[PDB]
Amino acid sequence: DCERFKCPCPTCGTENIYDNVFDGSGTDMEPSLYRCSNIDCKASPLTFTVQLSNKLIMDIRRFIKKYYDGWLICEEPTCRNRTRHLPLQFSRTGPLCPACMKATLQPEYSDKSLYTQLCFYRYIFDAECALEKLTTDHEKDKLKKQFFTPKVLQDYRKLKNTAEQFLSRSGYSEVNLSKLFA
Amino acid sequence: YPHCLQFYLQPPSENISLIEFENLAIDRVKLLKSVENLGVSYVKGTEQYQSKLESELRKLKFSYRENLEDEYEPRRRDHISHFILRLAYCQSEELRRWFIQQEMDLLRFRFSILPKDKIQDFLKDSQLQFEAISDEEKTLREQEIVASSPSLSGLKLGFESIYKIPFADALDLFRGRKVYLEDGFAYVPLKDIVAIILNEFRAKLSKALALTARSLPAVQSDERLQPLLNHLSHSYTGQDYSTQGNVGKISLDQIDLLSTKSFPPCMRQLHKALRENHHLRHGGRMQYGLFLKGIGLTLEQALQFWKQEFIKGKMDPDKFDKGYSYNIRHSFGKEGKRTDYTPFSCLKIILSNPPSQGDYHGCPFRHSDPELLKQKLQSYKISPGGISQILDLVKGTHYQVACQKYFEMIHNVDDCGFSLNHPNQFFCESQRIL
Amino acid sequence: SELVQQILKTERVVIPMENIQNMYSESSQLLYLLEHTWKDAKFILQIMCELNVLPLALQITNIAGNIMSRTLMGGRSERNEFLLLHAFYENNYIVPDKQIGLVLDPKVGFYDKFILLLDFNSLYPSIIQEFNICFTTVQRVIPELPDPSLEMGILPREIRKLVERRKQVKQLMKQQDLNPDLILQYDIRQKALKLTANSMYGCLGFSYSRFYAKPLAALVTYKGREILMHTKEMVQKMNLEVIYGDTDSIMINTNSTNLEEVFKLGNKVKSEVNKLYKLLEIDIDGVFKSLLLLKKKKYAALVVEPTSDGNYVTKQELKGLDIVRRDWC
Ligand code: SF4
Ligand SMILES: [Zn+2]
Ligand SMILES: [Zn+2]
Incomplete structure (x- = not known):
């Protein structure tokens, strides 16, 4: 239930979506960044790592934009109010809508989303894992023989690194034990 | 074997990965449940009870050979595992009991393998009096030790590193006249050393345990740790082995044939029932229904099966479309995720969903009353001795093992191959042996 | 407003401002507001006439020991303080005071x-008596109950006087031809x-009251919490279900279609909880045919009280299902 990664082609003009590292079917499977999807055109988007890099940041830097600006929405499935001026009264679940005075209020982009999505990015740029988890010997050996240079790997490494550091920067993966057992 | 063996203390205020957190949680809980099962199966000293555990335990990253101070991997894992699950069971006596009891027996086992020198020296590192005799005193005091206590036979006492004690903690080894005395520095075989260690451990451990339970509210202001806030013992397994879309493809007709040899009692009896009735209530099917995805037949094929079993029992051939079949189909749609989009696990057909009059969904071994169930199971052509030893565990209110022993008998194979947790896993096995 | 027809069971005609000039231009409806006020005060009296506020409050104050003129005005500090002090200054202590x-x-x-x-009516006085807690009887500076091996002291003694007076009432009540x-x-x-007994613990949690020795409250909460927990697990054993819990309530499943064995299960658990403690009570209050659950304080149900001859009256009940957006079709 997150939002996929859409991508603009630098030459053919078409668009793309990058869901899982491998692009589909089994023994055929190929790396995502290899060939533009549009059948005919033959440009290979990998060779534009840096450009991808840009959009990556220039995309994430709106998701965060939402959260710290987080909407507030109503719960009693009739009222359906949308505002931000957090009111001050409180109860078990939290605060209370001013109009439907018999109901709670909920965040819209629940942080769980934000962290989920950042995991979703860091997923599809870290092929190394999904490569290791693969079962069949011969498939692994043949594909690696085929097209896993240090170069391609390194480029994945680069963008994946950007993502991972940018979330682990500081929000959520930590749980400060020094306040949890006092 | 590792340094690991240690008396829990001093919460390690690091700061860590949320992923690793829930990982350790699940791992440790698995270890606990397992140890309990493995134990209640056999008796302690049997070498199955050793082999199996020393396999599993080593498999889940907790016991290897020598390494650095404390940031060696498996000891750290053990450490943070416990000092998390501490937050698990702070809300019952029965719970805190079960947790203590299990950790107790684990430590017993996991400790019973250390080399003797490592044993005594680490006891030394533990507290003060944990010190050993000189074996010369074995010769010097064989008469005293042997004739004193009945806890030793003849003269053949092995080369155990016997121990010097303060009587002040011998509080049962001596009053029962079970040891020689040298000014309260009685000398006792290792057995009672383990005993006393374990008893002081239980004491101190409970004494700590109660404290956190008296200091809960902190977590209440977070919800990342919402599962382990109070959500472990519930309707998720170890994990989803027999999940959506695993190995299987079989045509309709064969089902009944396979039934007589492959359907775990709950299912089997429900399928007999719907073979007779050809009608079921609002909730009932929603077990059997998803259970069929266990083998994973196609909807229109499953729809056809149910249609046969519906209109032959006179269910209006028009209702079917806008009624049952509708939801039966949706059972593979958008919402149902972890609610319907999954099969069921015994810990969902036990811990909840009360079965009502004359209905069939629900664990027989729980809901079926004892002796009615006795004749009932017996009707599966079962030796009454097996039935009896089964009903024993059944009133021991631990049932998975009962299902287990039943299968073990009905196929006569003298290993359960696993520790069952899901009826569909049971099924995949039953088909494996063919 | 609502009460006009719940207990009083009649109509309440009301008139906003913009019709007050209409009634300035009116003798029938102005006089009608006058007679309406007549009936208003009337129904207001009928409230007392039925609920019997006067002798109730009177007897309370009589046993309370504090100014009735400050009783109706509303208060739990008074009807606890100026009662407790009666006994506490027969025991030659010295208490703190107002600020x-x-x-x-x-x-x-x-x-x-x-x-x-x-219903866990009388839960807190129950637990307090059961475990003999009283100011003098705790090294209060995490706290723990002393050995019950001491002789019961001061406050549980007063609670016990109240409970035995309830016993007296229940005994002399079984008379006939009165x-x-x-x-x-x-x-x-x-x-x-029962009113004051339920009020009792309130004299502590109200921080601004004199006897706000909060460790007391922490302890009592801990106790009742474990009480409810044991209750749940014990009845859980019984092959039943337990849906809703709260400090002073348990909404429980029954899972049956008969009517009489129901009461047997009731009496069963009624003795079960007593196996834990004697002084603790329990009330098998009401029976529902079928029920919907949205939240505590907000649900829909069928009150089914068993009329005589094992029959039953059945009435609907809509606890809080309003429609606030006056917008629909
Ligand atoms: S293991 Fe559980 S689900 Fe399977 S037959 Fe036994 S009680 Fe039923
Ligand atoms: Zn292109
Ligand atoms: Zn509102």
Whole structure:
């Protein structure tokens, strides 16, 4: 239930979506960044790592934009109010809508989303894992023989690194034990 | 074997990965449940009870050979595992009991393998009096030790590193006249050393345990740790082995044939029932229904099966479309995720969903009353001795093992191959042996 | 407003400002507001005439020991303080003076078979008596109950006086041919006693009251919490279900279609909880045919009280299902 990664082609003009590292079917499977999807055109988007890099940041830097600006929405499935001026009264679940005075209020982009999505990015740029988890010997050996240079790997490494550091920067993966057992 | 063996203390205020957190949680809980099962199966000293555990335990990253101070991997894992699950069971006596009891027996086992020198020296590192005799005193005091206590036979006492004690903690080894005395520095075989260690451990451990339970509210202001806030013992397994879309493809007709040899009692009896009735209530099917995805037949094929079993029992051939079949189909749609989009696990057909009059969904071994169930199971052509030893565990209110022993008998194979947790896993096995 | 027809069971015609000039231009409806006020005060009296506020409050104050003129005005500090001090200054202490729960995750879902309502009326005075807590009897500076091996002290003694007076009422109540005067006297007296007994613990949690020795409150909360927990697990054993819990309530499943064995299960658990403690009570209050669960304080149900001959009246009940957006079709 997150939002996929859409991508603009630098030459053919078409668009793309990058869901899982491998692009589909089994023994055929190929790396995502290899060939533009549009059948005919033959440009290979990998060779534009840096450009991808840009959009990556220039995309994430709106998701965060939402959260710290987080909407507030109503719960009693009739009222359906949308505002931000957090009111001050409180109860078990939290605060209370001013109009439907018999109901709670909920965040819209629940942080769980934000962290989920950042995991979703860091997923599809870290092929190394999904490569290791693969079962069949011969498939692994043949594909690696085929097209896993240090170069391609390194480029994945680069963008994946950007993502991972940018979330682990500081929000959520930590749980400060020094306040949890006092 | 590792340094690991240690008396829990001093919460390690690091700061860590949320992923690793829930990982350790699940791992440790698995270890606990397992140890309990493995134990209640056999008796302690049997070498199955050793082999199996020393396999599993080593498999889940907790016991290897020598390494650095404390940031060696498996000891750290053990450490943070416990000092998390501490937050698990702070809300019952029965719970805190079960947790203590299990950790107790684990430590017993996991400790019973250390080399003797490592044993005594680490006891030394533990507290003060944990010190050993000189074996010369074995010769010097064989008469005293042997004739004193009945806890030793003849003269053949092995080369155990016997121990010097303060009587002040011998509080049962001596009053029962079970040891020689040298000014309260009685000398006792290792057995009672383990005993006393374990008893002081239980004491101190409970004494700590109660404290956190008296200091809960902190977590209440977070919800990342919402599962382990109070959500472990519930309707998720170890994990989803027999999940959506695993190995299987079989045509309709064969089902009944396979039934007589492959359907775990709950299912089997429900399928007999719907073979007779050809009608079921609002909730009932929603077990059997998803259970069929266990083998994973196609909807229109499953729809056809149910249609046969519906209109032959006179269910209006028009209702079917806008009624049952509708939801039966949706059972593979958008919402149902972890609610319907999954099969069921015994810990969902036990811990909840009360079965009502004359209905069939629900664990027989729980809901079926004892002796009615006795004749009932017996009707599966079962030796009454097996039935009896089964009903024993059944009133021991631990049932998975009962299902287990039943299968073990009905196929006569003298290993359960696993520790069952899901009826569909049971099924995949039953088909494996063919 | 609502009460106009719940207990009083009539109409309340009301008139906003913009019609006050209409009634300035009117003799029938102005006089009608006048006679309306007449009836207003009338119904206001009928409130007392039925609920019997006057002798109730009177007897309470009589046992309370504080100014009734400051009783109606509303207060729990008075009707606890100026009562306790009576005894506490027969015991030659010196007191200070004036200056300036657990949810159980209601498992929402419709229920078809009969549902029973367990009331923990008199839970806090019960636990306090049961475990003999009193200011003098705790090294209060995490606190722990002393050995019950001491002789019961001061406050539980007063609680016990109240409970035995309830016992007195319940005993003399079983009389026959009594004049309805003394009948109502007894019943209302019992009501008043239950009132103050439920009020009792309130004299502590109200921080701004004198006897706010909060460790007391922490301890009592801990105790009642474990009480409810044991209750849940014990009845859980019984092959039943337990949907809703709260400090002073248990909404429980029954899972049956008969009517009489129901009461047997009631009495069963009624003795079960007593196996834990004697002084602790329990009330097998009400029975529901079928029920829907949205939240505590907000749900829909069928009150089914068993009329005589094992029959039953059945009435609907919509606890809080309003429609606030006056917008629909
Ligand atoms: S293991 Fe559980 S689900 Fe399987 S037959 Fe036994 S009680 Fe039923
Ligand atoms: Zn292109
Ligand atoms: Zn509102």
